[PDB]
Amino acid sequence: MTPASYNLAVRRAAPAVVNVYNRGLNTNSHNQLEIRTLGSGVIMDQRGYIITNKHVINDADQIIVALQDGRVFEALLVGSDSLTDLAVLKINATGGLPTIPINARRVPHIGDVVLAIGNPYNLGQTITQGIISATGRIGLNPTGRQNFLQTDASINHGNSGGALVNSLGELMGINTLSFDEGIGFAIPFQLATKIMDKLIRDGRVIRGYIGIGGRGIVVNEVSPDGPAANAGIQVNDLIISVDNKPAISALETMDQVAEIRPGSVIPVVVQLTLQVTIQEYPA
Amino acid sequence: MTPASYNLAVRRAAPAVVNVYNRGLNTNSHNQLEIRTLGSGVIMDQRGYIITNKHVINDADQIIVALQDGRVFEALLVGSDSLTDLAVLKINATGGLPTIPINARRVPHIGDVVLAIGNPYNLGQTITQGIISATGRIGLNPTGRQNFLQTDASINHGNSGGALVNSLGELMGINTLSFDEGIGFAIPFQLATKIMDKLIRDGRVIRGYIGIGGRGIVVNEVSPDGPAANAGIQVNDLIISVDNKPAISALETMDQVAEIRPGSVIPVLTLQVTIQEYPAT
Amino acid sequence: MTPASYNLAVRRAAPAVVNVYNRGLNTNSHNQLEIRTLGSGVIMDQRGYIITNKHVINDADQIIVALQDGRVFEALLVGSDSLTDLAVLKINATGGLPTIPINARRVPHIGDVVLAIGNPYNLGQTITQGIISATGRIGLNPTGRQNFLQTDASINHGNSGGALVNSLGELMGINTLSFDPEGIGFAIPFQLATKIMDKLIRDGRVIRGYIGIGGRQGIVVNEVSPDGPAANAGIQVNDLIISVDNKPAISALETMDQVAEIRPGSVIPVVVMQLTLQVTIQEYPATNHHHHHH
């Protein structure tokens, strides 16, 4: 017979999970480059773009990336995002690079078997398995850990920034050491992809803000003094059209707003059409 | 090729797992119902019965149940049992209720893949995967967590009182934290079912108690003047037969004793013994 | 539609996993064999040899083994090995024994599903599942936890000395509590455990060949310990080894594992760069200092 195994997922995806090293110049008294932090990362494509955790590369003076095939490269930071604890690096790829399998049409399901791939510097590349416990949201509106992907695969320091893949080796998400026990989190791959593209284009993730709450949609708390204030909007009414389409849920409405570029003026129903200019999510 | 997955089990079972909120008036003073303890529960049937843990509902003064589909209900406490940390609730079943898949003929086996489904109101409904490490006894004589079903599927607070199902979505047990590292406990579903019915029938679990720790069956203790001392029972003699059936093993006889109602007199020479309700905990 | 299950692996392998009890005569204040330390062990074959952990049987005044089917036996300590934390026990059972399924041709793969079977006397036989996170090395040459097999199957006190098996019930390794580790367990790869057990059965201890080199179409000497088989012969520091005992000297690790396998006292030819040199291999420097870093 054939022993049950997830080796196919490993062979397919593991070569694209790298070791990421944050090194500093003022870490020791002799001003010699020294490791301050370690982590994992995922090569996204052949141009040399790698996704890792922001907390892994914070304040580094030199970022080194090491691959399983032995190659070592210095990486450049292209940008980071505190809300997702994601950062994007850029290595100068010569001779081709291994890249993570991705299936943009695949829809992750609660209960899908998942493998967490991390290259802890304390024990070599490691793999652990669990399942997807909650799928998380892929929109740009920040809502906290409860909306990241959750899994019971062991996620720890030698995993963080590494990959979460299904049994086919396809990228399900980017492992991230906690947020907000026995449960780990990851940024859904669909959001991790959107964030990387935004970080390459602009050097930061620009989100659309409107300062409103609720749960038609009832404006529960909308007095952040943001845009919703400097326009037609009371602290106790019900909005209808987010812009030109129904405002079912608050969550599924803050995502539309997040994608709206700052400076844009849109029509917020409530039926006195009061226009508002979207701002850039607070620092 | 399709990704390996236990989503089938999830689709079938998760809608039947609910959040349970234990509110309390004499929570801090305004004398207003403040949420004191959260938990999970399993909707068992269309009559609206729900199984959760006894620790979740202790001192509630008001219990609320929220289903994954959004509906919220006030719940009636129909009974609870300390020995198994189970409690039964009942809610309005009018509009139809999602129910947990259950197969009474399904024999659980060590090695079976199981999913632990808990509805914590902090990170939402969470599903974890493991296997059954030990099947546990389904008898009524209380013994201890050791005889409960054991699994390595993460069992925590946002799980406690929730469901443990197999890959078909069928109920294997009810997750319980602890009350007779890496391993969690659950009440086997066959015991949970028997406990729930006894609670519906009498409002409490009534257990037979003879008081003969037979560690044939070699007796070993009958000191608390138990209904054994008050009959033809020594202190270190064996037991060839009880209630008229064989006396093969001790744990299968104690579950048997706990199954006969208190008062009744049966043959245990032969000084017809009288079973008396288990000692109130 | 039958539920997903690893019960088959359980039925084949769990019977071979036993409880091991280590007692001592001066445990209490009455001078009676008092259960000190517990553990698990695995019956490797019908003759009655059993593998368990060294730390479980250390300082044992009497070792007893209890099988799942009830049978209970007193056991003989045939030997142990600190480096791998393994020990071998022997029990005389004339009525047939349940043995662990073993397939010497199976090659373990990273991602293979595994079950950790531990027979503790606190919760009964325990079974947990995970996968192989890293396969580990199988040579005799000392290495430390980093090269044992790694798994996310949970490895604790009630597992140690127990079995790690694949979904067919075949032995992948022997569970061992850490070495050299958060939610990661270690096991001695079965190929290594089998070699160790054979050596313990024959010699009562593991005898490893030593050549005295730390050299990382040839090998580059890094160090040449004082008074070692290499030190006391043609070898100083930057010498290029072409082959040892007339065998292509490709890798340092392969060559070191090859030396560990050579009986001490043997005299072998070591080609360097042309320059043939006769070296008499010694026993591996006796020292329980290997996993300390000190």
PDB file of N, CA, C and O in Angstrom, chain B residues 106 109-113 129 131 133 146 150 152 166-168 181 183 185, chain C residues 1-7 10 115 122-123 125-129 154 156:
ATOM      1  N   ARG B 106     -22.915   3.799  14.741  1.00  0.00           N
ATOM      2  CA  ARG B 106     -21.512   4.064  14.427  1.00  0.00           C
ATOM      3  C   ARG B 106     -20.604   3.705  15.589  1.00  0.00           C
ATOM      4  O   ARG B 106     -20.731   4.259  16.679  1.00  0.00           O
ATOM      5  N   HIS B 109     -13.634   4.313  16.709  1.00  0.00           N
ATOM      6  CA  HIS B 109     -12.385   3.557  16.839  1.00  0.00           C
ATOM      7  C   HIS B 109     -11.206   4.486  17.008  1.00  0.00           C
ATOM      8  O   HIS B 109     -11.179   5.574  16.452  1.00  0.00           O
ATOM      9  N   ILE B 110     -10.245   4.033  17.792  1.00  0.00           N
ATOM     10  CA  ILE B 110      -9.011   4.743  18.017  1.00  0.00           C
ATOM     11  C   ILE B 110      -8.366   4.932  16.639  1.00  0.00           C
ATOM     12  O   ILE B 110      -8.310   3.991  15.836  1.00  0.00           O
ATOM     13  N   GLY B 111      -7.898   6.145  16.356  1.00  0.00           N
ATOM     14  CA  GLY B 111      -7.302   6.411  15.060  1.00  0.00           C
ATOM     15  C   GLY B 111      -8.232   7.165  14.139  1.00  0.00           C
ATOM     16  O   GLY B 111      -7.794   7.705  13.101  1.00  0.00           O
ATOM     17  N   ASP B 112      -9.520   7.226  14.506  1.00  0.00           N
ATOM     18  CA  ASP B 112     -10.504   7.932  13.674  1.00  0.00           C
ATOM     19  C   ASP B 112     -10.198   9.422  13.628  1.00  0.00           C
ATOM     20  O   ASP B 112      -9.866  10.021  14.656  1.00  0.00           O
ATOM     21  N   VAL B 113     -10.293  10.018  12.444  1.00  0.00           N
ATOM     22  CA  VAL B 113     -10.088  11.446  12.340  1.00  0.00           C
ATOM     23  C   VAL B 113     -11.335  12.154  12.900  1.00  0.00           C
ATOM     24  O   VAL B 113     -12.481  11.788  12.580  1.00  0.00           O
ATOM     25  N   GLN B 129      -8.488  19.831  14.075  1.00  0.00           N
ATOM     26  CA  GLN B 129      -8.454  18.424  13.663  1.00  0.00           C
ATOM     27  C   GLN B 129      -7.496  17.577  14.458  1.00  0.00           C
ATOM     28  O   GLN B 129      -6.447  18.039  14.849  1.00  0.00           O
ATOM     29  N   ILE B 131      -7.314  13.079  16.063  1.00  0.00           N
ATOM     30  CA  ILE B 131      -7.819  11.736  15.900  1.00  0.00           C
ATOM     31  C   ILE B 131      -8.267  11.337  17.283  1.00  0.00           C
ATOM     32  O   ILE B 131      -7.988  12.043  18.261  1.00  0.00           O
ATOM     33  N   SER B 133      -7.753   9.298  20.473  1.00  0.00           N
ATOM     34  CA  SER B 133      -6.642   8.604  21.151  1.00  0.00           C
ATOM     35  C   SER B 133      -7.117   7.438  22.016  1.00  0.00           C
ATOM     36  O   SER B 133      -6.397   6.464  22.184  1.00  0.00           O
ATOM     37  N   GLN B 146     -10.300   9.957  32.879  1.00  0.00           N
ATOM     38  CA  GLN B 146      -9.583   8.837  32.267  1.00  0.00           C
ATOM     39  C   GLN B 146     -10.454   7.933  31.396  1.00  0.00           C
ATOM     40  O   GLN B 146      -9.983   7.417  30.379  1.00  0.00           O
ATOM     41  N   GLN B 150     -10.592  10.477  24.550  1.00  0.00           N
ATOM     42  CA  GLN B 150      -9.445  11.387  24.509  1.00  0.00           C
ATOM     43  C   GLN B 150      -9.079  11.648  23.077  1.00  0.00           C
ATOM     44  O   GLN B 150      -9.162  10.756  22.246  1.00  0.00           O
ATOM     45  N   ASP B 152      -6.507  14.428  20.388  1.00  0.00           N
ATOM     46  CA  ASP B 152      -5.457  15.441  20.312  1.00  0.00           C
ATOM     47  C   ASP B 152      -5.939  16.632  19.504  1.00  0.00           C
ATOM     48  O   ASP B 152      -5.153  17.512  19.164  1.00  0.00           O
ATOM     49  N   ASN B 166     -16.783  13.059  13.425  1.00  0.00           N
ATOM     50  CA  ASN B 166     -15.868  12.358  12.539  1.00  0.00           C
ATOM     51  C   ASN B 166     -15.888  12.995  11.151  1.00  0.00           C
ATOM     52  O   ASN B 166     -16.513  14.039  10.963  1.00  0.00           O
ATOM     53  N   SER B 167     -15.212  12.397  10.172  1.00  0.00           N
ATOM     54  CA  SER B 167     -15.156  13.029   8.842  1.00  0.00           C
ATOM     55  C   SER B 167     -16.458  13.034   8.058  1.00  0.00           C
ATOM     56  O   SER B 167     -16.543  13.672   7.005  1.00  0.00           O
ATOM     57  N   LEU B 168     -17.463  12.316   8.548  1.00  0.00           N
ATOM     58  CA  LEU B 168     -18.763  12.321   7.891  1.00  0.00           C
ATOM     59  C   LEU B 168     -19.600  13.410   8.535  1.00  0.00           C
ATOM     60  O   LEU B 168     -20.646  13.771   8.009  1.00  0.00           O
ATOM     61  N   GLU B 181      -2.194  18.422  28.688  1.00  0.00           N
ATOM     62  CA  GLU B 181      -1.186  18.918  27.757  1.00  0.00           C
ATOM     63  C   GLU B 181      -1.146  18.029  26.507  1.00  0.00           C
ATOM     64  O   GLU B 181      -0.643  16.900  26.541  1.00  0.00           O
ATOM     65  N   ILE B 183      -3.588  16.488  25.066  1.00  0.00           N
ATOM     66  CA  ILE B 183      -4.790  15.667  24.965  1.00  0.00           C
ATOM     67  C   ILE B 183      -6.013  16.316  25.602  1.00  0.00           C
ATOM     68  O   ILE B 183      -5.955  16.879  26.701  1.00  0.00           O
ATOM     69  N   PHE B 185     -10.378  15.996  26.381  1.00  0.00           N
ATOM     70  CA  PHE B 185     -11.389  15.007  26.718  1.00  0.00           C
ATOM     71  C   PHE B 185     -12.779  15.369  26.178  1.00  0.00           C
ATOM     72  O   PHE B 185     -13.104  16.534  25.984  1.00  0.00           O
TER      73      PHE B 185
ATOM     74  N   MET C   1     -18.678   5.776   1.673  1.00  0.00           N
ATOM     75  CA  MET C   1     -18.563   6.756   2.788  1.00  0.00           C
ATOM     76  C   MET C   1     -18.310   6.084   4.141  1.00  0.00           C
ATOM     77  O   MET C   1     -19.246   5.698   4.849  1.00  0.00           O
ATOM     78  N   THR C   2     -17.035   5.914   4.470  1.00  0.00           N
ATOM     79  CA  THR C   2     -16.632   5.351   5.758  1.00  0.00           C
ATOM     80  C   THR C   2     -15.821   6.503   6.347  1.00  0.00           C
ATOM     81  O   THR C   2     -15.169   7.240   5.611  1.00  0.00           O
ATOM     82  N   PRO C   3     -15.865   6.696   7.667  1.00  0.00           N
ATOM     83  CA  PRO C   3     -15.087   7.824   8.188  1.00  0.00           C
ATOM     84  C   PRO C   3     -13.582   7.692   8.010  1.00  0.00           C
ATOM     85  O   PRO C   3     -13.047   6.596   8.061  1.00  0.00           O
ATOM     86  N   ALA C   4     -12.915   8.822   7.771  1.00  0.00           N
ATOM     87  CA  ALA C   4     -11.457   8.847   7.615  1.00  0.00           C
ATOM     88  C   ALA C   4     -10.876   8.301   8.929  1.00  0.00           C
ATOM     89  O   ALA C   4     -11.294   8.716  10.015  1.00  0.00           O
ATOM     90  N   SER C   5      -9.917   7.381   8.833  1.00  0.00           N
ATOM     91  CA  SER C   5      -9.376   6.741  10.031  1.00  0.00           C
ATOM     92  C   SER C   5      -7.958   6.134   9.915  1.00  0.00           C
ATOM     93  O   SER C   5      -7.547   5.671   8.858  1.00  0.00           O
ATOM     94  N   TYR C   6      -7.228   6.112  11.021  1.00  0.00           N
ATOM     95  CA  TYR C   6      -5.904   5.515  11.033  1.00  0.00           C
ATOM     96  C   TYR C   6      -5.926   4.286  11.911  1.00  0.00           C
ATOM     97  O   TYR C   6      -4.879   3.808  12.360  1.00  0.00           O
ATOM     98  N   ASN C   7      -7.124   3.747  12.130  1.00  0.00           N
ATOM     99  CA  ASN C   7      -7.282   2.589  13.009  1.00  0.00           C
ATOM    100  C   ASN C   7      -6.478   1.357  12.605  1.00  0.00           C
ATOM    101  O   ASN C   7      -6.002   0.608  13.463  1.00  0.00           O
ATOM    102  N   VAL C  10      -3.197   1.640  13.949  1.00  0.00           N
ATOM    103  CA  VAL C  10      -3.328   1.402  15.391  1.00  0.00           C
ATOM    104  C   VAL C  10      -3.384  -0.096  15.753  1.00  0.00           C
ATOM    105  O   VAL C  10      -2.713  -0.541  16.700  1.00  0.00           O
ATOM    106  N   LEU C 115       1.755   8.392  13.438  1.00  0.00           N
ATOM    107  CA  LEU C 115       1.058   8.287  14.692  1.00  0.00           C
ATOM    108  C   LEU C 115       2.122   8.034  15.757  1.00  0.00           C
ATOM    109  O   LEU C 115       3.040   7.237  15.542  1.00  0.00           O
ATOM    110  N   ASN C 122      -0.953   6.463  33.227  1.00  0.00           N
ATOM    111  CA  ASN C 122      -1.612   7.640  33.787  1.00  0.00           C
ATOM    112  C   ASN C 122      -2.895   7.935  32.986  1.00  0.00           C
ATOM    113  O   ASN C 122      -3.868   8.472  33.524  1.00  0.00           O
ATOM    114  N   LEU C 123      -2.892   7.582  31.702  1.00  0.00           N
ATOM    115  CA  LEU C 123      -4.060   7.779  30.841  1.00  0.00           C
ATOM    116  C   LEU C 123      -4.229   6.604  29.876  1.00  0.00           C
ATOM    117  O   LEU C 123      -5.060   6.650  28.962  1.00  0.00           O
ATOM    118  N   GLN C 125      -2.788   3.710  27.001  1.00  0.00           N
ATOM    119  CA  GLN C 125      -2.090   3.895  25.733  1.00  0.00           C
ATOM    120  C   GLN C 125      -2.603   5.160  25.030  1.00  0.00           C
ATOM    121  O   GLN C 125      -3.810   5.320  24.850  1.00  0.00           O
ATOM    122  N   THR C 126      -1.695   6.062  24.655  1.00  0.00           N
ATOM    123  CA  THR C 126      -2.084   7.299  23.965  1.00  0.00           C
ATOM    124  C   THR C 126      -1.603   7.361  22.533  1.00  0.00           C
ATOM    125  O   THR C 126      -0.469   7.027  22.237  1.00  0.00           O
ATOM    126  N   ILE C 127      -2.475   7.810  21.647  1.00  0.00           N
ATOM    127  CA  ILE C 127      -2.139   7.905  20.243  1.00  0.00           C
ATOM    128  C   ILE C 127      -2.431   9.296  19.688  1.00  0.00           C
ATOM    129  O   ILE C 127      -3.528   9.803  19.861  1.00  0.00           O
ATOM    130  N   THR C 128      -1.445   9.905  19.027  1.00  0.00           N
ATOM    131  CA  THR C 128      -1.620  11.244  18.456  1.00  0.00           C
ATOM    132  C   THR C 128      -1.084  11.283  17.033  1.00  0.00           C
ATOM    133  O   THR C 128      -0.219  10.493  16.706  1.00  0.00           O
ATOM    134  N   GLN C 129      -1.601  12.162  16.171  1.00  0.00           N
ATOM    135  CA  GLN C 129      -1.070  12.205  14.826  1.00  0.00           C
ATOM    136  C   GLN C 129      -0.528  13.504  14.351  1.00  0.00           C
ATOM    137  O   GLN C 129      -0.931  14.573  14.784  1.00  0.00           O
ATOM    138  N   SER C 154       2.674  15.151  18.965  1.00  0.00           N
ATOM    139  CA  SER C 154       3.167  15.616  20.268  1.00  0.00           C
ATOM    140  C   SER C 154       3.956  14.554  21.032  1.00  0.00           C
ATOM    141  O   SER C 154       3.429  13.503  21.354  1.00  0.00           O
ATOM    142  N   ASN C 156       5.659  13.595  24.426  1.00  0.00           N
ATOM    143  CA  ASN C 156       5.851  13.882  25.851  1.00  0.00           C
ATOM    144  C   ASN C 156       6.210  12.644  26.683  1.00  0.00           C
ATOM    145  O   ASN C 156       6.488  11.569  26.142  1.00  0.00           O
TER     146      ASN C 156
END
